[PDB]
Amino acid sequence: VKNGEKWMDRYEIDSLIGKGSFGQVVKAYDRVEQEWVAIKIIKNKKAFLNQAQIEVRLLELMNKHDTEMKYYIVHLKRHFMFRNHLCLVFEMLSYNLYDLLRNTNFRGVSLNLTRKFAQQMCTALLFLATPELSIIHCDLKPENILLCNPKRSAIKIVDFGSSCQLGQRIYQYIQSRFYRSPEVLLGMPYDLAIDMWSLGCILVEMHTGEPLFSGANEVDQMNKIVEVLGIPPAHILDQAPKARKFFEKLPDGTWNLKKTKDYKPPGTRKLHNILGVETGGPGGRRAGESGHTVADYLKFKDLILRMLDYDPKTRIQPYYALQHSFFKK
Ligand SMILES: COc1cc(-c2ccnc(N)c2)ccc1Cl
Ligand SMILES: [Cl-]
Ligand SMILES: [Cl-]
Numbered sequence: 001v002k003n004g005e006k007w008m009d010r011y012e013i014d015s016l017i018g019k020g021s022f023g024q025v026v027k028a029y030d031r032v033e034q035e036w037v038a039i040k041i042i043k044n045k046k047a048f049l050n051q052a053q054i055e056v057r058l059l060e061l062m063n064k065h066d067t068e069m070k071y072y073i074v075h076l077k078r079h080f081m082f083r084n085h086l087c088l089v090f091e092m093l094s095y096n097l098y099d100l101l102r103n104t105n106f107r108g109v110s111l112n113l114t115r116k117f118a119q120q121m122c123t124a125l126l127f128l129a130t131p132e133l134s135i136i137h138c139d140l141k142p143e144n145i146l147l148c149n150p151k152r153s154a155i156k157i158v159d160f161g162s163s164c165q166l167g168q169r170i171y172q173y174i175q176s177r178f179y180r181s182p183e184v185l186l187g188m189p190y191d192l193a194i195d196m197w198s199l200g201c202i203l204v205e206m207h208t209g210e211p212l213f214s215g216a217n218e219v220d221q222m223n224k225i226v227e228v229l230g231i232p233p234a235h236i237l238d239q240a241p242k243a244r245k246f247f248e249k250l251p252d253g254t255w256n257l258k259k260t261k262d263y264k265p266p267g268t269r270k271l272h273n274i275l276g277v278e279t280g281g282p283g284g285r286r287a288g289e290s291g292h293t294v295a296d297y298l299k300f301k302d303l304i305l306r307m308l309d310y311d312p313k314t315r316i317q318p319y320y321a322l323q324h325s326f327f328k329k
Contacts, residue, residue: 001026001041007082011039011089022048022161023085027092037077038093042086052086055160058135059088065130072124074146074158093146093156097206101142106209108282111300112291114207116153118303119327121145121199124157126318129192134166136190138174140198142205166191177221178211182232183312185222187242193312196321200307207300208274208282222246223263228274230267231255232310271308275301299326 001024005013011028014036018025023043030037042052059076077089097117100109108114121140128135137144139162148154162174174194175184181197183190204212212228215221223246226232237243237255247255257266272278277297280287303326306316316324 008080011037013039020159020161022052030089033077036092038090040088040090042088044084049086051161052088055163056086056088058160058163058165061133062127062135065127065133067127067130069123069127069130072120072127072156074156090158093148093158094150095147097142097145097147097155097202100147101206101209104209107285108205108207108209110289110291111207111281111286111296113153114203114300115326117145117155117206118199118203119322120155121157121202122318122321125192125195125199126322128195129318134192135160136164136166136192137195137198138162138164139176139179140195140202141176141179142202145202177215177218178213180218180221181312182222182225182236182310185218185225185242185246186232186236186240187245188236188240191312193315193317196307196315196318200304203300203307204271204274204304212274219246219260223257226257226266227264227269228267228271229308229310231257236310271301271304275304277301299324302326 001013003014007013010031012031014027014029016024017027017038023041025038025040028037028039042048056076056079062070062073063076074093075091077091079086079088081087127133128137137157137160139159140157144157144159145155146158148156164170169190172187174190175181175198179198179201181190181194184194201212213221213224215224231247234253234255237247237249243255246258248258249255274282275297276282276284276286278294281292281297286292303316303321303324307321309315
């Protein structure tokens, strides 16, 4: 697109910030508001335009709801068509939580900073669960969470490119694999609870430095989830179109893993040991640090296991996650 280029006597393009499957994100000076903005420039192809039109609709819907809960979502300022590209103008944000982890050499941030991220994200998910919104993000991951300011720990969610309202599902195959919920792996109709699954995965990773469940494909993904959480309950597997991609049913009414050529036995890779609850935190690296006692760890573990409930019906919801003891001073 090229630095110094001027659009519509309003925006002066500075530089490329980001690239997506959707197109590209540039830093630009808005002469009207007299501020820098991020312009998301959608590719000029029907597929990308139509999905970006859904993104614009969902962001404008969120903007029509002024309440304290809405300020963890990136602000869409406006949109226009230019050179046959849909252009979405956002506020400028700082770097993303994956960059934050890369900056720790993938050793993770403190339980105290993890808590601050958890509280903001739970509040954002509470906002998206507003009945008249009922918005499923569908692609929550560290890269889609940006710092408001490189000096500060405030964050906002970006990229509603995959997002849909409850009952407006388009795709069966959604979410980034590492953050994909059991219900999506199993080909089942999904609801807002898939975002809470992603969040649980994200918070462990923010504190350990490493993805909780780093599957190389869907079969590997489900196997890595089963190592930590055991075989999913029969009532879920009995209703799951893709249950037999991963599992096999036996006369007893019971399920277990399909195996290929040579994972830890189901439920034996304990979150207790991944977090290092009794062993000084991840890799023992938090031994003796304040805010990293067994009691603080047990509360965190308890909240994560509620977020990683196999059953989307009983998986913790945002309001109840915010009332958890992990968040009590
Ligand atoms: C990579 O930097 C940004 C990216 C976005 C962004 C990127 C993709 N989708 C949405 N909705 C927003 C917005 C602001 C900034 Cl600074
Ligand atoms: Cl990642
Ligand atoms: Cl997706």
